[PDB]
Design a protein around this ligand. Structure first.
Ligand code: SF4
Ligand SMILES: O=P([O-])(O)O
Ligand SMILES: O=P([O-])(O)O
Length: 219
DNA sequence: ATGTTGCTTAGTCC
DNA sequence: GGACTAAAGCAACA
């Protein structure tokens, strides 16, 4: 199917009962946004359809993409990620605002699970379910040469996608693994506030990941 | 009030 | 694998 069909069918998905419930349950729970409209639906990927680089996240944040409708938009993860994409020369501007004209150059963003999960922890069954969408979405990104897993969950999801053994591809920040056709699989700590604010993942470390991804992608 | 909540990782154990 | 938990620094939240 083409992208329009992908977006149409994805947004109507209701395969995971716990997530169909949670994504609406959190609406109005955060003071700063009470009374505002929430997307509260599956989150479609965003970016360059001709991207050579794919940043693969974990899932929608309750008041992040689950609220704005765009990956990494409206929360601490995006506050960290988007300015860095611009600093690396991969976007039109530093900030991402729903409904703006932000363009990503050579990069596309999505995640393992597309509906906000409780405690940011999807179940093994929910991951297997949404993996069907990963197949469809990555299938619509023919030019990707570098797949960047943001966090352990994301890496494992990508390993399943490529039919790779976990034992041979452990999760460690900076890990680099080869993929068929001269492609690459990179692993980085997730951009979560828990990782950046605690010093586990610094702005320097992530920009480096981005610069390495560009290098490996021929950009 | 100032204590609680919410935002992954790495190690443990079966 | 999968379930469980102590640990990390910050600030909205109550
Ligand atoms: S998480 Fe994925 S599979 Fe589950 S309901 Fe949402 S879009 Fe569908
Ligand atoms: O809502 P996310 O894309 O920042 O997880
Ligand atoms: O932000 P607070 O401290 O007025 O609740």
């Amino acid at each position: 199917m083409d992208r329009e069909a992908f977006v149409q069918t994805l947004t109507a998905c209701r395969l995971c009962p716990r997530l169909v419930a949670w994504r609406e349950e959190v609406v109005g729970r955060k003071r700063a946004f009470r009374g505002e409209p929430y997307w509260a639906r599956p989150v479609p990927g965003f970016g360059d359809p001709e991207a050579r680089i794919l940043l693969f996240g974990l899932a929608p944040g309750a008041h992040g993409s689950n609220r704005t409708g765009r990956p990494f938009t409206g929360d601490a993860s995006g506050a960290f990620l988007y300015p860095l994409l611009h600093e690396a020369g991969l976007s039109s501007k530093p900030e991402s605002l729903p409904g703006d004209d932000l363009r990503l150059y050579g990069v596309y963003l999505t995640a393992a699970v597309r509906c906000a999960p409780p405690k940011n922890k999807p179940t093994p069954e929910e991951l297997r379910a949404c993996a069907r969408w990963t197949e469809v979405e990555l299938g619509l990104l023919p030019e990707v040469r570098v797949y960047v897993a943001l966090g352990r969950i994301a890496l494992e999801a990508l390993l399943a996608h490529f039919g790779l053994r976990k034992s041979a591809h452990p999760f460690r920040h900076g890990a680099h693994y080869p993929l068929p056709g001269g492609r690459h699989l990179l692993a980085s700590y997730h951009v979560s506030r828990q990782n950046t604010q605690t010093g586990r993942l610094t702005r320097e470390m992530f920009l480096e990941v981005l610069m390495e991804a560009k290098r490996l992608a021929g950009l």
